[PDB]
Ligand binder design. Structure first.
Ligand SMILES: *[C@@H]1O[C@H](CO)[C@@H](O[C@@H]2O[C@H](CO)[C@@H](O)[C@H](O)[C@H]2NC(C)=O)[C@H](O)[C@H]1NC(C)=O
Ligand SMILES: *[C@@H]1O[C@H](CO)[C@@H](O[C@@H]2O[C@H](CO)[C@@H](O)[C@H](O)[C@H]2NC(C)=O)[C@H](O)[C@H]1NC(C)=O
Ligand SMILES: *[C@@H]1O[C@H](CO)[C@@H](O[C@@H]2O[C@H](CO)[C@@H](O)[C@H](O)[C@H]2NC(C)=O)[C@H](O)[C@H]1NC(C)=O
Ligand code: 147
Ligand code: NAG
Ligand code: CA
Length: 640
């Protein structure tokens, strides 16, 4: 019936911000080659203050060369003695975020690590100082090469922590002059980090924030007892339809209400990865077509706005928040400067399911809500009103609410699936750019000769690596193949996911069913080396080991194989071929209906080989193991 909002008996917890994750893995892969103005528009929808999602926090993966959900992301140290702070796209993204919002909060977290850190094992805690040295290098590089101040550093995403590592990471941070950098742990479940912090005082000192994943709006007792800041450091991961927008809406309020969590960070920031990759379209918005410029400003953008435009890190939650009688919730925040924000949500169970965890039914029905400004809030007379209705009307400003009394009270009619933001703030705006081009399938004729001398990014556009890492490569000591694409991993990473045994990058349209793929290939390893080109590749990401399709392999021992699977268990054809290491060959692979054929240097090697049909999927290139190889003059001709 009546709901009191008061600051007289003090304040709730400090609000730390809403944000999103770019990474885990390659989630922003297709954003980088958007043409202007569209690329800059997308970034504004995300990061420009008083405009769109206006995010307070950007968390990114510290690439470790391993597959991390929708691809691999390049590390700053591929090998021992290697340092490079210009690979990938997270540097660029952080800088674009900071350009639009100087006060944005930056976070880094590793998912995988380069294999050499493991010194013989697939384990990052073999040499604690070495792994901490690697991580801290990254933070220094952000400052030195990009003028970026990383605010938070994590441990090992969704994987075990080592208390001695966390301590060494603190010591190393301090030693390198990074006392200001905070540590968040352990980016997994509430335990065992929470009880570890109660039993170990030295550990308690070095951990600033307990970050838990997909906590279903709740925390646990040991966490409250720690007195540490509690963040949902990874949540959401839901398709960005209205259903996903409802999930985001509900958890933004209730993570604080039910679980004392003062930050929530969505995986992921923008769906800029092929949608047939795992968890397709689970970004706050969608930008998965750089070749057309088409992007979608999805519902979750506006749900974010309802909190982000009208709150800032450093504000405080009131003590007066909770659930509504007939369902839904209300939070309220101030800033100590007389401003007040009220955010109300009425998300129906049927339209707010997150993928993790799934909630048992709860009822939401028509109701009325009365709010009374008690304490030092009563002196407010006027409130701006923002309204959103899911299922649709988005982030629409409604007529101002005048209190018009001396009461300090007001009433609302609330139906289902609604968000209301009521605030003293006048800065709100539903930012708008003209509509962008219609969606178009991936070009049915496509070529890249990789002839780019000073590339802006370290890899060619649209190639999404799924195991291994492929980079622009300049080789002055050749005139015919001076500018190529090279797979640069020479050993398996400390994997997070189950990377394939062979390297692979996919490109194009997963709907393609008839296609001709051509590429110049070059094997660097004598006797043992191997490369392939492929078509109808159907799976990638965390499922890359499962990929089927048609794979045309050539080996440096003078052999070829055609397989139905990336693991090469299922043979379509095999035989001999005039192939050695360190020689350039042109490979052609034709796939049509039930039949395939392969050419070597324009000459038929095998023809009318039966493949499974129907089948559809991307084109790809790769290497037999984690080995050096080059590719040049890539072309694809395909029918969807
Ligand atoms: C964490 O938030 C919870 C609510 O989710 C607070 O626990 C109590 O909740 C009841 C019922 O909602 C309130 O009436 C009380 O005011 C709360 N009790 C306390 C401890 O004051 C709790 O305040 C929070 N826990 C903290 C901050 O340690
Ligand atoms: C409400 O919040 C706004 C946003 O901070 C406050 O506006 C700033 O206030 C400080 C001093 O209080 C000024 O130095 C800034 O220049 C102000 N910025 C703007 C946008 O004018 C404001 O003080 C708060 N109080 C209210 C209700 O106006
Ligand atoms: C891929 O190739 C197959 C084989 O050419 C195409 O399927 C044939 O389509 C014709 C009519 O268009 C039928 O009469 C044949 O019987 C089909 N072949 C088989 C074995 O089914 C198919 O249309 C092509 N797909 C696309 C979209 O390009
Ligand atoms: O299998 N799980 O329950 C599971 C739960 C949380 C996980 O962490 C997260 O999942 C996300 C997808 O929803 C992304 O993969 C993200 O990269 C990963 O950190 C990964 C797997
Ligand atoms: C939910 O609760 C309302 C009001 O109490 C009631 O009218 C309705 O039947 C309930 N719906 C279901 C299916 O639980
Ligand atoms: Ca070239």
């Amino acid at each position: 019936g009546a709901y009191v909002l008061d600051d007289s008996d003090g304040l709730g917890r400090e609000f730390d911000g809403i944000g999103a994750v770019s990474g885990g893995g390659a989630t922003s892969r297709l954003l980088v080659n958007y043409p202007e103005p569209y690329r800059s528009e997308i970034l504004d929808y995300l990061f420009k203050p008083n405009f769109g999602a206006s995010l307070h926090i950007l968390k990114v993966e510290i690439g470790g060369d391993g597959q991390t959900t929708d691809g691999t992301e390049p590390s700053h140290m591929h090998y021992e003695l290697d340092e490079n702070y210009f690979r990938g796209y997270e540097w660029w993204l952080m800088k674009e975020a900071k350009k639009r919002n100087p006060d944005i909060i930056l976070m880094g977290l590793p998912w995988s690590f380069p294999g050499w850190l493991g010194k013989g094992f697939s384990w990052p805690y073999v040499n604690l100082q070495l792994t901490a040295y690697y991580v801290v290098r990254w933070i220094l590089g952000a400052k030195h090469y990009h003028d970026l101040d990383i605010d938070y550093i994590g441990i090992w995403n969704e994987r075990p922590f080592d208390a001695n590592y966390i301590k060494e990471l603190r010591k190393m941070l301090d030693y390198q002059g990074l006392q200001r950098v905070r540590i968040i742990a352990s980016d997994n479940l509430w335990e065992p980090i929470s009880s570890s912090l109660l039993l170990d005082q030295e550990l308690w000192k070095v951990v600033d924030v307990i970050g838990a994943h997909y906590p279903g709006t709740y925390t646990v007792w040991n966490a409250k007892m720690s007195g540490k800041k509690l963040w949902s450091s990874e949540d959401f991961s839901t398709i960005n339809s209205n259903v996903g927008a409802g999930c985001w809406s509900r958890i933004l309020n209730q993570n604080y209400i039910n679980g004392n969590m003062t930050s929530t960070i969505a995986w992921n920031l923008v769906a800029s990865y092929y949608e047939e990759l795992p968890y397709g379209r689970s970004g706050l918005m969608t930008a998965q077509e750089p070749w057309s410029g088409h992007y979608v400003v999805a519902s979750p953008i506006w749900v974010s706005a309802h909190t982000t435009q009208f709150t800032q890190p450093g504000w405080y939650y009131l003590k007066t928040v909770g659930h509504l009688e007939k369902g839904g919730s209300y939070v309220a925040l101030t800033d100590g400067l007389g401003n007040l924000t009220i955010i109300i949500e009425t998300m129906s169970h049927q339209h707010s399911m997150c993928i993790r965890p799934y909630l048992p039914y709860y009822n939401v029905s028509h109701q009325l809500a009365t709010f009374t400004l008690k304490g030092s809030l009563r002196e407010i007379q006027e409130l701006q009103v923002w309204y959103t209705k899911l299922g649709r009307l988005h982030f629409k400003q409604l007529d101002t609410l005048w209190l018009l009394d001396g009461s300090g009270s007001f009433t609302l009619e609330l139906e289902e699936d609604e968000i209301f933001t009521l605030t003293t703030l006048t800065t709100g705006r539903k930012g708008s750019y003209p509509p962008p081009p219609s969606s178009k399938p991936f070009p049915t004729n496509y070529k890249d000769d990789f002839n780019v001398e000073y590339p802006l990014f370290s890899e060619a556009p649209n190639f999404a690596d799924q195991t291994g890492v492929f980079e622009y490569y300049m080789n002055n000591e050749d005139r015919e193949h001076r500018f190529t694409l090279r797979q640069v991993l020479n050993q398996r990473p400390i994997t997070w996911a189950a990377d394939a045994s062979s390297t692979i990058s996919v490109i194009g349209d997963h709907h393609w069913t008839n296609m001709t793929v051509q590429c110049d290939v070059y094997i660097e390893t004598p006797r043992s080396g191997g490369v392939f080109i492929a078509g109808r590749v159907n799976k990638g990401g965390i499922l890359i080991r499962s990929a089927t399709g048609v794979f045309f392999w050539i080996f440096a021992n003078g052999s070829y194989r055609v397989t139905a699977d990336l693991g090469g268990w299922i043979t379509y054809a095999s035989g001999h071929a005039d192939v050695t290491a360190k020689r350039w060959y042109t490979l052609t692979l034709g796939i049509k209906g039930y039949f395939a054929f392969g050419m070597l240097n324009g000459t038929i090697l095998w023809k009318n080989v039966r493949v499974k049909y129907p089948g559809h999927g991307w084109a790809a290139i790769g290497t037999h193991t984690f080995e050096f190889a080059q590719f040049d003059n890539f072309r694809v001709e395909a029918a969807r």
